[PDB]
C-alpha cells in the first residue's frame, strides 16, 4: 500500500443539514451551497476533533496523512476514547516536504493550509497551480464544489529530479 488511509477521519458534527455528508457515497445528492476562495494561512499543527474526513496534503502529488504517532481502528479491545492528531509542519519539497494541505472541518466548510509566498515551486502554497487550475484528487468536488465544471487533463512536473504525474482541472 501507499498514500492510503485506514481510519483517521470522522469527528464530524451534524450541525445544519447543509449537505456536508453529500460526498459519502456521492453518486447522487451532490451540490454546492453557494457559489458566486482566499489565500491560506501558515502550516502548523492540526486539531483532530474538529476535522471531518481525510486531510489531503499537496506535495507534487496528493497524499493522505494519518494521525501523528499513529492511530488504531480495529474493534473489541479494552480502552477508552480516541484523540490523536496529525502533523503538517512542512516547507516546500525542494527544501522540505510538501506545499500545503486542505481539509473540511466539522460543520461542513473547508480549511486550507499553506506556506509563505516568495514557478509553482517558487511561490505556490496550495493545490492551486494557477487561480484557474487545481490538482485533481478524489475529494476535490467536496472541498471545492464551485469547481465542478472544471475540465480535467493529465500533466507532469519536476521537483528536484523526480517526475510527478498529475491530474489537473482548469477553467476554459
Amino acid at each position, epitope marked *: 500500500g501507499s498514500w492510503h488511509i485506514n481510519r483517521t477521519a470522522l469527528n464530524c458534527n451534524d450541525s445544519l443539514h447543509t449537505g456536508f455528508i453529500a460526498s459519502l457515497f456521492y453518486t447522487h445528492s451532490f451540490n454546492s451551497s453557494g457559489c458566486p476562495h482566499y489565500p491560506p494561512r501558515q502550516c502548523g499543527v492540526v486539531s483532530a476533533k474538529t476535522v471531518c474526513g481525510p486531510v489531503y496534503c499537496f506535495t507534487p*502529488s496528493p497524499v493522505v496523512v494519518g494521525t501523528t504517532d499513529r492511530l488504531g481502528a480495529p474493534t473489541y479491545t479494552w480502552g477508552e476514547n480516541e484523540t490523536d492528531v496529525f502533523l503538517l509542519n512542512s516547507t516546500r519539497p525542494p527544501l522540505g516536504s510538501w506545499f500545503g494541505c486542505t481539509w473540511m472541518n466539522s460543520s461542513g466548510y473547508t480549511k486550507t493550509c499553506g506556506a509563505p509566498p516568495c514557478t509553482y515551486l517558487k511561490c505556490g502554497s496550495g493545490p492551486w497551480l494557477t487561480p484557474r487550475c487545481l490538482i485533481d484528487y478524489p475529494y476535490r468536488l467536496w472541498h471545492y464544489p464551485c469547481t465542478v465544471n472544471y475540465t480535467i*487533463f*493529465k*500533466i*507532469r512536473m*519536476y521537483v528536484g529530479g*523526480v*517526475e510527478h*504525474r498529475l*491530474t489537473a482541472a482548469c477553467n476554459f
Partner: antibody
Amino acid sequence: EVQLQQSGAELVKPGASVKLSCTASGFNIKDTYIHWVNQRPEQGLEWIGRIDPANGHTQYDPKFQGKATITADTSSNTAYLQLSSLTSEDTAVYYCATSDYSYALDSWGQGTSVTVSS
Amino acid sequence: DIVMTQSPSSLAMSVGQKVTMSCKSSQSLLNSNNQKNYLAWYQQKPGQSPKLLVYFASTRESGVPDRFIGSGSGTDFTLTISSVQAEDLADYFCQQHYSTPYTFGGGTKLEIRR
C-alpha cells in the same frame, strides 16, 4: 522519466497467447496514459495502442484490433498487453510508455522480447 | 494514417559537426487553436529503449542537453545537433502525436566518422 518494469522475454508457440506486464514505480498510473508500441526486427516503431487507467478507456490501432488487448489494474499500478493467436510476424519487442495530455511518449520501459517459434 | 517520411535514412557526420535530419508528414501537424506543432523526436541508442528528446516539435525535454534543437512547422520539421559527440550515435525517429493512430517515422540511423 518514471520507472517502468516489464516482464521477461517470452517464447510463445505459434497460435498461442501471451500476456505482457508493465509495472509502474514512484507514481500512480491513474495520472498518465499508458501506451504500448511494438518494434519488429530491423523495423520502425509501430504504435499498438493506449489506455487511460483512470476510466479504463482503451484506444487501439486499426491493424492491432482483435489481437491486442490493453488493460490496467490501479490497485497494483500495472498495465497489461494481451496478444492472442500470435504468428511469426508478431516476433518483436513490445515497449510500454507513459504520456500526458500531449500524448508524447516521454518515459519508456526496458522492452519485452516476444519470440513466436516452434 | 499520417505517413511520416524521414530524410535521409543513413547519415554519417564526424565529431563536432552540425547535423540536420528532416521529417515530413503527409498532413500538417499544426493545431490552429494552440498554434503548436504536434511532433516529437525519439533517440534509440543501439540495444536500448527509445528516449524522448524534443516533443511539440520545438519543446526540448527536461534533461536532454541543449545541443539538440527541434525546428520546423506545418508539414516540415528538422532535428539538428549543433555539435555532435561520440555518444550521439543512435537511430532517430519522428512521431506525430496529433491524431490517432500516432505514426512513427522510418528512422534516420546516425553514424559517426572517425
